Amino acid sequence: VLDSKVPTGPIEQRWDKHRFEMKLVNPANRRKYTIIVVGSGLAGASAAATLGEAGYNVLCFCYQDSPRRAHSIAAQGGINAAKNYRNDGDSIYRLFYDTVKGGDFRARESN
Amino acid sequence: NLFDMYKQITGEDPYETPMRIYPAVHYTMGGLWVDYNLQSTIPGLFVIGEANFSDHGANRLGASALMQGLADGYFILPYTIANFLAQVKPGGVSIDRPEFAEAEAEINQRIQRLLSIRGKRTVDSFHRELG
Amino acid sequence: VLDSKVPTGPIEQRWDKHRFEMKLVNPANRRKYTIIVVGSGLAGASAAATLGEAGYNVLCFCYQDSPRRAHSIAAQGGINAAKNYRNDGDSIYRLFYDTVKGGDFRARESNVYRLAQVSVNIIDQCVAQGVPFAREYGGLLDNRSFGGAQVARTFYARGQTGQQLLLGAYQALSRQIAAGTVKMFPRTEMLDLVVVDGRARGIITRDMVTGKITRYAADAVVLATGGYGNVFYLSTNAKGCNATAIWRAHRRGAFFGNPCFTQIHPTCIPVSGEYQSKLTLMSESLRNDGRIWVPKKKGDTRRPQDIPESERDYYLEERYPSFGNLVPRDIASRAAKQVCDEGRGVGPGGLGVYLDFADAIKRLGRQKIAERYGNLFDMYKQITGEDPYETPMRIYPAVHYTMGGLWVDYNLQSTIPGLFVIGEANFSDHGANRLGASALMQGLADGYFILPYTIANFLAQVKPGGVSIDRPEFAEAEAEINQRIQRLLSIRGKRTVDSFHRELGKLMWDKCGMARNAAGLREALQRIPEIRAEFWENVNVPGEANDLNQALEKAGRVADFLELAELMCLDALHREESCGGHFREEYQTPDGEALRNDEQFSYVAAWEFTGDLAKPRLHKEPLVFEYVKPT
Amino acid sequence: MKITLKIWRQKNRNTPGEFKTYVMDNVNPDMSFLEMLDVLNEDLMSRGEEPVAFDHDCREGICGMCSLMINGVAHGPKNAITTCQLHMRSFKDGDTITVEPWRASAFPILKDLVVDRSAFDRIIQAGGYISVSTGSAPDANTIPVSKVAADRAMDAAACIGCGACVAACPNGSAMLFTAAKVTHLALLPQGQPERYQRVVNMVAQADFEGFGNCTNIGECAAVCPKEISLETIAQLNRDLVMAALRGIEPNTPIVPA
Amino acid sequence: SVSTGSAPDANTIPVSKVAADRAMDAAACIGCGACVAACPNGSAMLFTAAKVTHLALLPQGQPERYQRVVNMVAQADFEGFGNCTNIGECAAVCPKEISLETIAQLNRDLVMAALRGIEPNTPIVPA
Numbered sequence A: 001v002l003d004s005k006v007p008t009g010p011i012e013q014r015w016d017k018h019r020f021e022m023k024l025v026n027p028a029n030r031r032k033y034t035i036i037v038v039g040s041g042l043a044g045a046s047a048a049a050t051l052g053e054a055g056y057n058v059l060c061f062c063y064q065d066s067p068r069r070a071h072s073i074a075a076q077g078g079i080n081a082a083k084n085y086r087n088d089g090d091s092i093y094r095l096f097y098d099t100v101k102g103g104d105f106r107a108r109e110s111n
Numbered sequence B: 001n002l003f004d005m006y007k008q009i010t011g012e013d014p015y016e017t018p019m020r021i022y023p024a025v026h027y028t029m030g031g032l033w034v035d036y037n038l039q040s041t042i043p044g045l046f047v048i049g050e051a052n053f054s055d056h057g058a059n060r061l062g063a064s065a066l067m068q069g070l071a072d073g074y075f076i077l078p079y080t081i082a083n084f085l086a087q088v089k090p091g092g093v094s095i096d097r098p099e100f101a102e103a104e105a106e107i108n109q110r111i112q113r114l115l116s117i118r119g120k121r122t123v124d125s126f127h128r129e130l131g
Numbered sequence C: 001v002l003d004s005k006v007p008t009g010p011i012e013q014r015w016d017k018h019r020f021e022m023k024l025v026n027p028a029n030r031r032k033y034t035i036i037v038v039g040s041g042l043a044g045a046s047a048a049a050t051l052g053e054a055g056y057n058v059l060c061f062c063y064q065d066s067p068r069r070a071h072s073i074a075a076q077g078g079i080n081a082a083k084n085y086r087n088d089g090d091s092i093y094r095l096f097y098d099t100v101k102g103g104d105f106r107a108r109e110s111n112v113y114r115l116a117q118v119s120v121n122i123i124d125q126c127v128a129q130g131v132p133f134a135r136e137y138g139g140l141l142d143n144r145s146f147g148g149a150q151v152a153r154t155f156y157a158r159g160q161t162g163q164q165l166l167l168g169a170y171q172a173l174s175r176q177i178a179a180g181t182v183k184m185f186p187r188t189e190m191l192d193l194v195v196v197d198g199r200a201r202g203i204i205t206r207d208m209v210t211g212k213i214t215r216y217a218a219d220a221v222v223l224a225t226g227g228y229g230n231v232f233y234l235s236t237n238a239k240g241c242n243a244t245a246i247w248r249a250h251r252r253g254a255f256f257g258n259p260c261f262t263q264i265h266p267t268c269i270p271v272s273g274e275y276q277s278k279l280t281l282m283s284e285s286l287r288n289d290g291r292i293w294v295p296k297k298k299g300d301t302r303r304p305q306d307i308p309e310s311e312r313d314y315y316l317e318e319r320y321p322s323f324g325n326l327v328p329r330d331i332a333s334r335a336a337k338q339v340c341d342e343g344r345g346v347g348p349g350g351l352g353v354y355l356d357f358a359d360a361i362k363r364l365g366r367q368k369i370a371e372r373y374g375n376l377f378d379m380y381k382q383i384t385g386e387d388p389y390e391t392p393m394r395i396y397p398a399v400h401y402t403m404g405g406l407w408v409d410y411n412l413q414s415t416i417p418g419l420f421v422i423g424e425a426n427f428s429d430h431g432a433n434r435l436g437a438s439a440l441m442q443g444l445a446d447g448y449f450i451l452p453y454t455i456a457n458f459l460a461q462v463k464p465g466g467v468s469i470d471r472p473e474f475a476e477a478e479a480e481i482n483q484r485i486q487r488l489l490s491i492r493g494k495r496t497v498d499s500f501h502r503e504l505g506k507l508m509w510d511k512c513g514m515a516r517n518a519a520g521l522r523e524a525l526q527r528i529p530e531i532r533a534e535f536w537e538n539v540n541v542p543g544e545a546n547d548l549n550q551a552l553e554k555a556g557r558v559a560d561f562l563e564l565a566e567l568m569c570l571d572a573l574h575r576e577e578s579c580g581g582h583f584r585e586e587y588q589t590p591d592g593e594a595l596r597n598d599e600q601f602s603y604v605a606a607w608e609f610t611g612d613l614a615k616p617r618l619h620k621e622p623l624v625f626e627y628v629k630p631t
Numbered sequence D: 001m002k003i004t005l006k007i008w009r010q011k012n013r014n015t016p017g018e019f020k021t022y023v024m025d026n027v028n029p030d031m032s033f034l035e036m037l038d039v040l041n042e043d044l045m046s047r048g049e050e051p052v053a054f055d056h057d058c059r060e061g062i063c064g065m066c067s068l069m070i071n072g073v074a075h076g077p078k079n080a081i082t083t084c085q086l087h088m089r090s091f092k093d094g095d096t097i098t099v100e101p102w103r104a105s106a107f108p109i110l111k112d113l114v115v116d117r118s119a120f121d122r123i124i125q126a127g128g129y130i131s132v133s134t135g136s137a138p139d140a141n142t143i144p145v146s147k148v149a150a151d152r153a154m155d156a157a158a159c160i161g162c163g164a165c166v167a168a169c170p171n172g173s174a175m176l177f178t179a180a181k182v183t184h185l186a187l188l189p190q191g192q193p194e195r196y197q198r199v200v201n202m203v204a205q206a207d208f209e210g211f212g213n214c215t216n217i218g219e220c221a222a223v224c225p226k227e228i229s230l231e232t233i234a235q236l237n238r239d240l241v242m243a244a245l246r247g248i249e250p251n252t253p254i255v256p257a
Numbered sequence E: 001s002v003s004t005g006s007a008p009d010a011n012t013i014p015v016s017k018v019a020a021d022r023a024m025d026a027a028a029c030i031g032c033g034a035c036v037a038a039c040p041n042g043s044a045m046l047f048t049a050a051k052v053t054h055l056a057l058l059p060q061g062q063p064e065r066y067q068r069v070v071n072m073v074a075q076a077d078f079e080g081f082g083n084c085t086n087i088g089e090c091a092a093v094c095p096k097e098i099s100l101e102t103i104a105q106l107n108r109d110l111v112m113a114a115l116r117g118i119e120p121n122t123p124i125v126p127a
Ligand SMILES: Cc1cc2nc3c(=O)[nH]c(=O)nc-3n(C[C@H](O)[C@H](O)[C@H](O)COP(=O)(O)OP(=O)(O)OC[C@H]3O[C@@H](n4cnc5c(N)ncnc54)[C@H](O)[C@@H]3O)c2cc1C
Pocket: A038, A039, A040, A041, A042, A043, A044, A061, A062, A063, A064, A067, A069, A070, A071, A072, A073, A074, A075, A076, A077, A078, B026, B049, B050, B051, B062, B063, B064, B065, B066, B067, B069
């Protein structure tokens, strides 16, 4: 069976509640684990860099000549963020509503 | 910039002549199912980026794929992966296990069969037909 | 009765709700109030600087040469904060949960949450003041784990973080002094507290340079006088640390909260004889890559490196096979004390246990180990005279911290109205065990972001002035102080003050130490009055009152320690359970871990001075947990 | 080990002092100098004489309260250590050891080996800080500081204020202490807005306190327990020169209460 | 050298439009290697200069620029690339039209670092 494992309570603090609930690995014990990261796109490279910063032994793989030849290099449009730097009414809740409405209500709200 | 690139590629100036366009597939919202922890059905396997269903639903918004990928890479995956790893004992599995040998044998057999078919049609023809 | 005065509602907004509820003092009216601050440590200096910035007339006192000579300057470890700069799950709620769980559920939740909430502002203020914290190559701050914490939430400045924090606080205090708002009195010590109409309205002090007795009057009195870990003769704190101010306050009417809660440090340098009185605190990470042992034969005169591995009684490895030899400091320290008392010691005086790094050196690389702790090895070589690389390191645990102190409410106010206790001198919120890199942040929180609000709330309800130094209470206190000093100088017995201090320290360490039982505590309680009478009968204090006589100060501190040890032993006997530092040999799990009784002893014990040193009254403050349930 | 000691003994500030000789028969090489002094004081108290008074708080070389000149060299013959850190395993049997306090016009003598060092506090009070009030601080990671600058600032800031540089300097100047404070507060961005005034004020306060000038001899660095290099002084000089170019004038001196 | 999670607010440090435009011009390097194969000396001067200019025109790269360039230059000398004769084929061949001002900026940074006594670190040995 499929378990979403989404948190409960108000949606504004679900992520923080889940972060508090989740376990942690001691920094001294981090070097004893090995993680394989297949892919060097935006997500792959960011995850590999963050896990290397944490201390885990990270193995990254890519079929291109260099890690910088992923197709994420080809994106022309910008990146969205709920910063409201233009004072036009943008907010985190507005961005969440827009994203969930643009998906035609076919995705989990928590993510 | 768009006019210059179109002139470089097509070879016709769009200022005086009409341009030609044709829609094509750009993104795949589908992928491997993941839970709130970005973990697939198989324990220990995490899918991030464009390879999972994630949260774009049936249609993603503009400037959202990069945001989702960076979110998964930076501020989401470390927490869930630490949560998973804190519940298991590090190490204990080498590359000498029978499963590794079976997978390697399957891969080698597949490669040998693909090289030994040596038919007539090229790979690109089959890809074009399927597409 | 004790009123905690904690706010209601959700714990995330209790502090803000209390801040909105509390009264305020207008800036024009601030200059009409006088506040006395006793102590120039982190909490004392921060509070004095903040109150001088506000506008109050602040009087600061310290017995050292300068405020920067106060303690909390040797705090090698860093300071904790819930900033989550490392992005590894740290948060304010996580820090609050960790602090309340590490205290073994023996402290109020509201104070802990308030401290965890203000830690971020503490770090921001410390950074802005010019404290040179460790930075990475990109220019941002760096964080490290505190040897067991599950997150890297500790900010450090090389190995002298406490020195830099105290320097910043002292620079702020000096800036306030230059403005004329704060008046500083170095080389003077508080000897009595003058209470007028049920309010702490002044102090009686004596400067040690000339011996003059002075009386000071103020609207509020703050006691940031530090801990009382020097009651035991051998301790890791300074020579001058004492409990005179807090004991005088308790005698005057203040309530003592959990005096038996003390914390020890496992890694300290054993003394080379009876002359030594201080043990140097190295670190907590030396046991990670070391094995504790003792020779099988007590009369082994051979060099420890030449002793065969089969001829070494590797206790803590034969015993307690679990925990991966990483036993808690309580069990390891208790075992070390037991094996040292049995006569199997390794030091010159028979005190200490061996900790060889030869196995670690062979297993690891010499360069990596040298980079891991090289300054510590150099300092150990400077002190002991033996190279840790080639010779096993002798260690012996010692008392480090005192979680006990004067009981305070949510407003940091003791039982006596107008008397505020901040820093290490109060019970505060550490419970039965103080987490690492949390005392400094607690003191800074009390000094900076807590005391001004509560003190303004208290001062807004009273009229400034009205009490001078000519009142009969000041004269009575001065006469009592002078009579006590004259009696101490006129005893002129045979034994010195250090002999009595060493006797009391040995008795307390043997009976009221980490391992406590009913018989030993009762024996110590019986023995204490005899020692006090002998001290008051056969002490030798040379010199004159109006001179730079350190013997008189030591005699006064030792007398206060003698009075306080009886109450400490009484509280240790009263608590019939084991929790945190307080460990009872008849209440523990078979594995050796402490066992709690949360349905009979889930409270805070405040002791009231009834005039008899053997029968002080007991008050219970119930503890209720709503967010973190006891486990 | 048998040690002959010559202690400077002075009753008070006004009473003239003199040297007094003492003999110690059994001295453990492992014990520190201050432990030997405590043993000698206990012996004197048992005999009935006035014990020697000296400053000691931390016994770890961090507080800086301890202050003694041993055999003509401050903080003992060994370098890069404080008086409390000095053990007698480096001394020789039968040696004669002379102990004196700091000798300077700005450091009055109060007892046998106790001196007043409030002049350093007055120097610090004369602008040697950053004028930031409580609660107005921005975020910690707002202003980035390079690792080299942070390391140099930490090196300059690790000054215990022992005053050994003043006593060791033949001119009796406090140049090393002021230079270290100025260098520590000038290498960080937070100290930038008021550095050029600060140094001048501090320098003026030193000249007002009674300290001498600096001949660039170099005893300060050779005696300083924390190994503060002479370059800090050069840094101070540069700042002062720049402060001279912009027309900065020192403020009124800090008069002691 | 910035870790994840320690970043301040985006609008904390202002950057002038001219500096941002020059940094973007220098940063648009696809790493094709045409500059190496075009220069007669076979040098990687244009690539290193472009990266150094990109990372040096922004305030975030200020704290460690003088070391950085030296390290990069040393790595080039360790990798087997030649010197620069200031011929100019790399600029004329480069697809993104990176000018020679990046080389001048790299030279200035190297000279300033040499004046400060910056010593290059150990070279990056391939696995
Ligand atoms: C032309 C174009 C324009 C776009 N524009 C935008 C835009 O404006 N805004 C937006 O939000 N999104 C945009 N996108 C979408 C966005 O670029 C992608 O969603 C993004 O690449 C997904 O992140 P990723 O980490 O999977 O990157 P990817 O580049 O998709 O990740 C692929 C990586 O995995 C590695 N890899 C793949 N298979 C293997 C294998 N078998 N073994 C080893 N390594 C392997 C590759 O080497 C590479 O490193 C655009 C996409 C395209 C194609």
